[PDB]
Amino acid sequence: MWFEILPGAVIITTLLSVPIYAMYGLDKLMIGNAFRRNMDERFSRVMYQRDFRLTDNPYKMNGLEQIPDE
Amino acid sequence: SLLKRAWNEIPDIVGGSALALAGIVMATIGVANYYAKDGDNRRYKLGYVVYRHDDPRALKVRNDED
Amino acid sequence: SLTPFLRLPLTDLTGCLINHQTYDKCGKFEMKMMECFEAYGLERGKRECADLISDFQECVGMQKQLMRFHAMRNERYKQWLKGERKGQEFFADPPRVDAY
Amino acid sequence: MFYMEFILSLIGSLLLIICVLVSVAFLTLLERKVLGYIQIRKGPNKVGLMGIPQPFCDAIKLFTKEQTYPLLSNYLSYYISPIFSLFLSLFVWMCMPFFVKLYSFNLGGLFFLCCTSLGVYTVMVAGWSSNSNYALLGGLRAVAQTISYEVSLALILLSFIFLIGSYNMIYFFFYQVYMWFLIILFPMALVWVSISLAETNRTPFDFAEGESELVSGFNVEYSSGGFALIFMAEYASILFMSMLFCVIFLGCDVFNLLFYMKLTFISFVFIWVRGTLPRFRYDKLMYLAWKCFLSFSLNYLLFFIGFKILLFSLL
Amino acid sequence: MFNNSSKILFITIMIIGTLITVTSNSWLGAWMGLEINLLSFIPLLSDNNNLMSTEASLKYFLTQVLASTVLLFSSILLMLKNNMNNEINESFTSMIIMSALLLKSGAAPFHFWFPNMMEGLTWMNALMLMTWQKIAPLMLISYLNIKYLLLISVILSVIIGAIGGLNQTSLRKLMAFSSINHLGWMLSSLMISESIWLIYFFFYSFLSFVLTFMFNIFKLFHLNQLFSWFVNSKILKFTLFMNFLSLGGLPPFLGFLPKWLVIQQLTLCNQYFMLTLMMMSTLITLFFYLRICYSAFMMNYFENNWIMKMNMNSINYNMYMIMTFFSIFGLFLISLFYFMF
Amino acid sequence: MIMILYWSLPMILFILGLFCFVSNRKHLLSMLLSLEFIVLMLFFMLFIYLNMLNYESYFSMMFLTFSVCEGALGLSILVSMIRTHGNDYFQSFSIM
Amino acid sequence: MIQLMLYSLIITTSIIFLNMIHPLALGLTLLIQTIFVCLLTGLMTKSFWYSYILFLIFLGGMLVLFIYVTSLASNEMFNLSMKLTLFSSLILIFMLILSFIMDKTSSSLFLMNNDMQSIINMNSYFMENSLSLNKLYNFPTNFITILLMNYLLITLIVIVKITKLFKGPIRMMS
Amino acid sequence: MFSIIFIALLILLITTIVMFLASILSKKALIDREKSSPFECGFDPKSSSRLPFSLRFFLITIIFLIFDVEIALILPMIIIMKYSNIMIWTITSIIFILILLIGLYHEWNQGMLNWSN
Amino acid sequence: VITNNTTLPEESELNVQELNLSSAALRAGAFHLGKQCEQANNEFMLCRQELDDPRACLAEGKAVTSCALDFFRKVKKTCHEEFTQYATCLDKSSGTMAFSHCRKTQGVFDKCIKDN
Ligand SMILES: COC1=C(OC)C(=O)C(C/C=C(\C)CC/C=C(\C)CC/C=C(\C)CC/C=C(\C)CC/C=C(/C)CC/C=C(\C)CC/C=C(\C)CC/C=C(\C)CC/C=C(\C)CCC=C(C)C)=C(C)C1=O
């Protein structure tokens, strides 16, 4: 009886779960980071300018191997 | 007399008036608690502020514990 | 600034409406102009504060700076139309985005 | 800005649009199944396997039936209004708080209010341009409805914003890490449920499309595609305010499947109110959203102003 | 004012908005004060039992809203070019500010709304329109040092407000055209001395405020209503009609004094030609003042027979006769005054 | 040139709005809509002035409030036309 | 490029607005005009607040004006003209061509955005609409806000006085 | 905001393609004389819907416009609490909401929130 | 504006080695950096406030960059892999790189700093 409501609801539960989780794959295919950089604050935008100035990929991180030995 | 008529016909207005009076009392308590201590001199300051030792704003700087 | 005619307590709210004192780069210049506008007056300040008025005017209005920039931009396109400036080297090297 | 971003923002927005449209279709299926089960009867069961391809039956038929070319109407304004209704009802869904950076909506409440005001503009344009008396009456009922609920919807939103301190809805997630806001805001859980039904033109406030007071409301001259885009616009608005009930009152997390289970539950609540309560009059709607909801919103705004000053001194 | 306390509230917000306008050290504060004054003066001047009062309110609304939007436009342009609140050298945006102020004040050639709207009013709202609503645009004209545009406005106002008042036999439009003619004397004093303008405005508002009370109490909306107006002694009507010779500038009445101080301050400041142009203007104003004065100077009239007793308010007629004494024998207070030194 | 390249456009659009306000139209509500358009262009010019200055854009809401109260005054005048006339024709009103 | 496109669209919609007799044509034209004006105003400020505020204002205003359209001048004829369509299309394509062949550094606005401000500005690193809207609630200009509350109350009293509710509903030939 | 413009144009484009696909795949039957007529519940109309409509809530609409521009001045003070004087902020905020309550309760007392009738 | 009368530092002065670390690498170990560069940062920002001239405090900027470089050399010599893991966790864990999203690798990095 009442369980037949659950077909037709889980599809609303699954498909609306699609456009988040798919980007949690679709960033990792090409960005390499699952979270692309947020631009709410001015300082995060300025440091994003700094990353995109240092490398063409702002999500590629410059570690301590960049620093020369002295 | 008029409180029973207002509490019978428009009870949401009476409940909202009680909530607004409680909010006015809590605003008075919050302002008095803010200005009882040194509320204008906040512990964490926005921006990067540096004071010299001879500055009059230097001795007002708090030294509390986080 | 203007003057209050037949000034009352009602001008105290109005007087602080628009001014450059609130976190602006120009306001100190404006303050200096207001200083002689308190000293010389509104009428002697039009003649004896010609240096302080013009500095504030091309500081917040940016008239001379923008005329300079539009003369720098028009001369480059004029040299490109006349043929002195090559199309490959038409623009100079760009600044870093971390600059300014 | 990095090139890949633009591409992934476009891809995520298009995937969101497609998933909201298919979820609108299955929301029609969900309403037609549980709304039957609100009564004794069943939902759609015969077509397809167990009624699952029934919205596909409803979409194949409405995309093939004859387009109405009405006589006394302004057809050049009658053809364009359901397109703009679906456009704003899908354009409002870009305001969704993603934990990835879909769009950096710092002013999401103002964007929501702008698209909320624009959807009823499409409704009242479609009501006038049909050149029918029932269509004009449904359009004027929609205008009276939005004039009733608009300032009430704004002030109630401000009270929630005060608990946040910012207009960014992802900041709803950090302030709900210990508990949901249904504990604090239960009277505006009722009030925001009342407003959200007036936002989506749903029962008890269904004066823009009345089946007994008027004849189909402003949809009386719309058929075979215009009615389809109007209907998907209405149900995408229902999905959006179900999502906003889950954002403000419940957990704002999006990496849990419990959020989408809660969104399906709030959509079931939206069907559930329609299947229980009778419709109002819009006289009583205007006397409700101006003398009760607005007064309670201002009063509890005063309560939150005092509580936020009390909390700020303690921090 | 009459029949409601909300009209007293509207008068209070009227005074508040006008005093916000004239005290502003920025054009934006003056503009928002004009918005407050317009908000206050729309509900007075509106009456649903009068079909023409709503049309007069609409004419006032359209004229003031057009003039306030041009005033804000040229104010924003003045802030855009010369970034302070004023201008060092005079330019065209100061002329646009002055023109938008002249549309508010009602001076020629932007005068056309003013007597066409005054037919729809009562007398008290007419007195509020042509006295207090000329405080805020005329005091804002004082900040602008423009001579040719103000001189053109002065010449056009004194020519038109004298010539135009000859045709109308209705007292409201005639008194509106008189207020246009007295506006030119105010604007001529505005570029020599602000104090002399204040004195001419105060005495003009005094003579307006005593001539309104004779028309408000007895409801004299036409010229032949003066001839049919019943008085219990014809010497009383002879004395009450001397205020028109006062407003015409005839000595030894009180209204010779503000015109005389304007003429003295104009000749000290070496203006002679436009002063002579304003001599020929005020003869025509005195000429259409004398058609009112026909109703009391012949001492005996073929009057209507049915009316036998005249009726008046207590406090209004008590306050009227204080000022009628000072509008006739007001030159004996020439020694008391100390503003003019 | 500098006045031509910057902010010369909303002067032209304000002049076009003023010509739309004073054009011979049959109804008063078209003049109310032209008033809304000149509010929009005054907002544009005031917004240019308040955005040359850094943190003085708070004034831009006050102009909105005085303009909305102007529009409410015009709408209430349009209601008060129905109390005396049966119409909003500008030809139907008294020319004197 | 987008700013010059908004310039061209605002010019074309202003030509359309000056030529429309019917109130609903004026309403739709000022709808797209306030959309384009809201986007253009946003370009000038560091934050996007006042565009949103102006959009709520100009959608709360014309919502009422349509009810007065349906109550007064509900029946009026639309007249499409080929001359206006050809003029608007030719001027629009001409200004898109002229904006494409223009240097966009010279035609850009000199007003400073949130990223046009320099890094050394510590006031730019705060929350984006804090210091702009601060002076509404600060000590020198709270009294202007007080005056605006009282002004809106007086406005409402004026509206109640000159729209008498007890005289009946309003329509044509009432 | 430039991305929001492009995605709004894309949503408008997609909805126009959807409506044109609904129009193309629709059944194309010949237009009858009385098929196109307005419905009016199955009978002749006697009046067009362009006839003037009576407005019984004009005061409520103008009060809505006044209250909406009052909404436009409340929305700042979420941000302004952390950056201003607390005393001045509370005097302005409680005085704002109390003046709105005086105005709304006064018009409730007069009955001006009831429809004209 | 800049004219010929105003002096400017030469190109040989501004050609020193600069910190070219990314945002996640700067945010990782940010609290340990300022405990070592408290004197240079405060002096440079104090003289940048009042002097308000980029030509002034150039040597203070050199001292700030030299202190940051010396701290990053000291991090690089001892347990570079723990700093790499912390910077990778802070990059990949959230959009805004909040320290609250992963604290285990922060504890491991602080344990290595306290042990070294
Ligand atoms: C006593 O006197 C009386 C009489 O005398 C005796 C009478 O006789 C009568 C008359 C009465 C009768 C004759 C009978 C009684 C009447 C009733 C009982 C009626 C009451 C019952 C109801 C109203 C039904 C209950 C209500 C329900 C179930 C609500 C739902 C109802 C609907 C109609 C909704 C269905 C509509 C739909 C689904 C619209 C279709 C649109 C879509 C499906 C679009 C969605 C699209 C998708 C899902 C996919 C699209 C995807 C796209 C475009 C993108 C995809 C792209 C990809 C690339 C994949 C009366 C009243 C009377 O009193």
Ligand SMILES: CCCCCCCCCCCCCCCCCC(=O)OC[C@H](COP(=O)(O)OCCN)OC(=O)CCCCCCCCCCCCCCCCC
């Ligand atoms: C925010 C406010 C914004 C406001 C401005 C908005 C402007 C938007 C653009 C407006 C453009 C207007 C162009 C109008 C052209 C048609 C004019 C018209 O009226 O056509 C009439 C026609 C039939 O109507 P008729 O017979 O006149 O009946 C009325 C009788 N009362 O009507 C019709 O046939 C209906 C229209 C059918 C159009 C079909 C087009 C052909 C197909 C295109 C390609 C589709 C491809 C789909 C698949 C794609 C796959 C990738």
Ligand SMILES: CCCCCCCCCC(=O)OC[C@H](COP(=O)(O)OCCC(C)C)OC(=O)CCCCCCC
């Ligand atoms: C056809 C247009 C329908 C009306 C759209 C109205 C949108 C809200 C009003 C507004 O000005 O919003 C400002 C907002 C400002 O952006 P936000 O501040 O919302 O977000 C920043 C933006 C990438 C950080 C989130 O802009 C828009 O909403 C874009 C509108 C695009 C219109 C395209 C067609 C011209």
Ligand SMILES: CCCCCCCCCCCC
């Ligand atoms: C109605 C006013 C509410 C806010 C009151 C603020 C001041 C409280 C007392 C402070 C004493 C120092």
